[PDB]
Enzyme design. Structure first.
Site, short mmCIF file in Angstrom:
data_model
loop_
_atom_site.label_atom_id
_atom_site.label_comp_id
_atom_site.label_asym_id
_atom_site.label_seq_id
_atom_site.Cartn_x
_atom_site.Cartn_y
_atom_site.Cartn_z
N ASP A 135 5.72 15.79 7.00
CA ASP A 135 5.05 15.58 5.69
C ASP A 135 3.53 15.75 5.81
O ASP A 135 2.78 14.73 5.53
CB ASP A 135 5.45 14.22 5.10
CG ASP A 135 5.23 14.14 3.59
OD1 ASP A 135 5.08 15.24 2.93
OD2 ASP A 135 5.18 12.99 3.09
N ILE A 184 0.86 -1.22 0.00
CA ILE A 184 0.00 0.00 0.00
C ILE A 184 0.88 1.25 0.00
O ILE A 184 0.32 2.37 0.12
CB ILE A 184 -1.00 0.00 1.19
CG1 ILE A 184 -0.31 0.13 2.56
CG2 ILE A 184 -1.88 -1.23 1.15
CD1 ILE A 184 -1.29 0.28 3.73
N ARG A 195 5.27 2.93 -0.74
CA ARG A 195 6.70 2.75 -1.06
C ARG A 195 7.33 4.07 -0.72
O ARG A 195 6.82 5.08 -1.19
CB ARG A 195 6.86 2.35 -2.53
CG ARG A 195 8.19 1.67 -2.84
CD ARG A 195 8.28 0.98 -4.19
NE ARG A 195 9.13 1.74 -5.07
CZ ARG A 195 10.34 1.40 -5.45
NH1 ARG A 195 10.87 0.25 -5.08
NH2 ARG A 195 11.01 2.20 -6.24
N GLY A 196 8.35 4.08 0.10
CA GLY A 196 9.12 5.31 0.35
C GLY A 196 10.56 5.14 -0.06
O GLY A 196 10.91 4.03 -0.49
N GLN A 197 11.38 6.17 0.17
CA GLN A 197 12.82 6.13 -0.16
C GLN A 197 13.49 4.95 0.53
O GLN A 197 14.41 4.37 -0.08
CB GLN A 197 13.52 7.43 0.23
CG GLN A 197 15.03 7.42 -0.07
CD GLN A 197 15.45 6.78 -1.37
OE1 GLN A 197 14.73 6.83 -2.38
NE2 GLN A 197 16.64 6.17 -1.39
N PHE A 198 13.09 4.62 1.77
CA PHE A 198 13.81 3.64 2.62
C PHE A 198 12.90 2.54 3.09
O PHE A 198 13.36 1.76 3.91
CB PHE A 198 14.41 4.30 3.87
CG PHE A 198 15.32 5.44 3.52
CD1 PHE A 198 16.56 5.19 2.95
CD2 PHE A 198 14.93 6.76 3.73
CE1 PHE A 198 17.43 6.23 2.65
CE2 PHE A 198 15.78 7.80 3.40
CZ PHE A 198 17.02 7.54 2.85
N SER A 199 11.68 2.45 2.58
CA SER A 199 10.68 1.59 3.20
C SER A 199 9.63 1.13 2.21
O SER A 199 9.40 1.81 1.20
CB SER A 199 10.05 2.29 4.40
OG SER A 199 9.34 3.41 3.97
N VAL A 246 5.42 -0.42 2.61
CA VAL A 246 4.28 -0.48 3.56
C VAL A 246 3.24 -1.45 3.03
O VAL A 246 2.88 -1.34 1.87
CB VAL A 246 3.68 0.90 3.80
CG1 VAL A 246 2.83 0.91 5.06
CG2 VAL A 246 4.76 1.96 3.85
#
EC number: 2.7.11.34
Lengths: 270, 267
Positions: free
Chosen positions: B142, B21, B23-27, B29
């Site tokens: 954010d 659900i 997607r981040g720079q380092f992660s 979810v």
């Protein structure tokens, strides 16, 4: 007075100043304290999990506190931290700016006036949202009673288990399974919830022994023998929800989603 | 893998991943289900040993430990964090029911404005959330309509799906490359209050490019809100939060006090 450690936040004793003992139980002492990082007043409960408990009770207490600190709901008293320090389990709890439903009751009584039905639903539909949330995480409350229910200047209900508010502070409702078997399950909470719905409407518990006799009290629970609420003040919906909750068989009681559903439909009906 | 009920929310064995659900720079979810109680959860997997230097790893662990202590009805609760499979695993409160981003798009397509009464109803909850975070000295970093969840019962949940902490609303102190601080949350908050009333960001443009954006931010140039629909209280709160100088923006306590008083009188 050990030095502050902001990096630990609520997870060390050095970041609190204890004021005084406000309670003592089977396994615990409770203190009024202030957080030194932000000036917030809290309850600090110290549980003697090594000195006063066997290995099973300690492991169960640690599991139970870990669940309670995951509850995030407007109507549940916050558990802000639990950590081992000085050979004890330290629990940091919210103290709400609200008086107990017990005081609200005692005040409406000494002024001879019934809590109106559209109000009773106000509070009760908050107590239910609280108990739904706890039961969804498989957490039993174990002592639902007026003294554990807090009510905000604004009409916001906080369910807690210490009977402690910020400024104002044989279990209270004995179930059949307590009396007959020393049993306590999810449906025991529903019995108590029913008894509390009654006490808000009556201004006293459903069950009293004749002349305070404890045997008479057990006989009246077994018959579910309580003075009926006056029906000109309380709907069939209400008196029937009481009657469903105050049923000697826990299997036959409704689950907290049903009771909360009824307390939502009645809260919008008015 | 083998269920481990003694472990509670602190091992990957007590969850079944359902779908990704975020997607981040380092992660990454995931939506997941706790197999101990069927409670639906978000599962964040943070690549603290692959994508980061030792400094960023230690900052990430310290921050997640402070986020884990937040407890407020309008803040997404962090249930647990633990290292397993060489990643930092975070188990969090799942909202996924709706967000301010969807609510703004709905009103837009229906060519209707959000009544001021509705604005204050949702905004006071977001201000409560941020006041809690700030009182514990945690910055959000954010704040935007997609990170403001709304439960089916109308409860705001402020989260961070993608861990954008550690942008949607360009701040003066990204243009100046100064640094992100607690007042940088206040700028976003004011931009979000604007967007609820206008159904678009204060510096949004049809044909929008970096040059025009910078000029607009330098001049705090955004279209005034219609005084016919939005009170002087709403328009002046937005105006004091959208201030180039972070030191002149109000603290979140002030903004929450205004929102609490505007909600009580409009309801």
């Amino acid at each position: 007075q050990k030095a502050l450690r902001p990096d630990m936040g609520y997870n060390t004793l050095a970041n609190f100043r204890i004021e005084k003992k406000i309670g003592r139980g089977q396994f615990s002492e409770v203190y009024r304290a202030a957080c030194l990082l932000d000036g917030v007043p809290v309850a600090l409960k110290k549980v003697q999990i090594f000195d006063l408990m066997d290995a099973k009770a300690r492991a169960d207490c640690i599991k139970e506190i870990d669940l309670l600190k995951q509850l995030n709901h407007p109507n549940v008293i916050k558990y802000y931290a639990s950590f081992i320090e000085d050979n004890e389990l330290n629990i940091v709890l919210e103290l709400a700016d609200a008086g107990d439903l017990s005081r609200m009751i005692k005040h409406f009584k000494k002024q001879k006036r019934l809590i109106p039905e559209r109000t009773v639903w106000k509070y009760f539909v908050q107590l239910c949202s609280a108990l739904e949330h706890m039961h969804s995480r498989r957490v039993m409350h174990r002592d639902i009673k007026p003294a554990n229910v807090f009510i905000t200047a604004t009409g916001v209900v906080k369910l807690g288990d210490l009977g402690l508010g910020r400024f104002f502070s044989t279990p209270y409702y004995m179930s059949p399974e307590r009396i007959h078997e020393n049993g306590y399950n999810f449906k025991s909470d529903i019995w108590s919830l029913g008894c509390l719905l009654y006490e808000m409407a009556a201004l006293q518990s459903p069950f009293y022994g004749d002349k305070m006799n404890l045997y008479s009290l057990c006989k009246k629970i077994e018959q579910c023998d309580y003075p009926p609420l006056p029906s000109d003040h309380y709907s069939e919906e209400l008196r029937q929800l009481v009657n469903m909750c105050i049923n000697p068989d826990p299997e036959k009681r409704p689950d907290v989603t049903y009771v909360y559903d009824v307390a939502k439909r009645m809260h919008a009906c008015t």
